[PDB]
């Protein structure tokens, strides 16, 4: 069908019945394997934020986005999929100053608001209304705040599973430093946990960034905070870890 597939879909969203949208994809997007269907199908979220009413977006999201609940036509929508122009549905939503939608997108769990398009622009830069930018900028502030507290809590409880959950989220990888000092202490998380001689947690930290060369505010880098067979386990652990970093510096 080539591009009238885009018209079929851009029309189905424009009406506003999520059943009616399914009924179109069910009988008009066959065969689902041919790549012209799968390409215009995976633009569905960019198309919803332009022409579809609000409730159709929620119904599209809460059904097919970042979910393994077998869905419908085995359709799985990536919330941060990228245009031919590199944009995400959050980009278009912002660009068109459709603010009530920029809100609902930033409240989703897998939203990545730090994606760069082809022009090398964040989704926040596309809008024209400052009122929309401010709410966008405010929401990043609240997310980084709430997530940084979940990070601290996860370390204090030694919730290993929750830590791998937070560093996996790419939006977090962009807005979260595993090194940063505690403001009124030394103190990277490596120092804090070398001092509790917690070998299992230090090994975990060494694998997820956490460089062993960062001093605290007393010059002491981690290795210099050292039965006693637990001590020599850390001391040999860091020795092996620093030797890996000094292989990139070939000269």
């Amino acid at each position: 069908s080539k591009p009238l597939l885009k018209l079929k879909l851009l029309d189905a969203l424009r009406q506003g019945s999520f059943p009616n949208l399914q009924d179109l994809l069910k009988k008009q997007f066959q065969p689902l394997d041919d790549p012209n269907v799968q390409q215009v199908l995976h633009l569905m979220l960019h198309y919803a934020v332009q022409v579809a009413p609000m409730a159709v977006i929620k119904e599209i999201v809460h059904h097919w986005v970042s979910t393994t609940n077998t869905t419908f036509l085995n359709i799985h929508l990536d919330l941060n999929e990228r245009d031919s122009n590199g944009n995400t549905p959050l980009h278009i939503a912002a660009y068109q100053s459709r603010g009530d939608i920029v809100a609902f997108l930033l409240d989703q769990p897998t939203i990545n608001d730090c994606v760069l398009n082809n022009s090398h622009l964040q989704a926040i830069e596309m809008c024209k209304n400052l009122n929309i930018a401010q709410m966008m900028q405010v929401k990043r502030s609240t997310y980084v705040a709430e997530t940084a507290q979940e990070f601290r809590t996860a370390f204090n409880n030694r919730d290993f599973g929750h830590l791998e959950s937070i560093l996996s989220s790419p939006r977090n990888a962009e807005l979260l430093d595993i090194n940063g000092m505690d403001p009124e202490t030394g103190d990277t998380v490596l120092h804090e946990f070398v001092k509790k001689r917690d070998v299992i947690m230090c090994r975990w930290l060494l694998e997820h960034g956490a460089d062993p060369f960062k001093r605290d505010r007393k010059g002491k880098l981690p290795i210099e905070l050292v039965k006693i067979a637990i001590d020599i386990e850390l001391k040999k652990l860091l020795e092996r870890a620093t030797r890996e970093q000094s292989v990139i510096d070939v000269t």
Partner: peptide, 16 residues
């Protein structure tokens, strides 16, 4: 004290 407990964690694990 200076910083509370959560805004303490924003300075530590936040990236500006």
């Amino acid at each position: 004290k200076h910083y509370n407990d959560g805004e303490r964690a924003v300075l530590q694990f936040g990236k500006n």
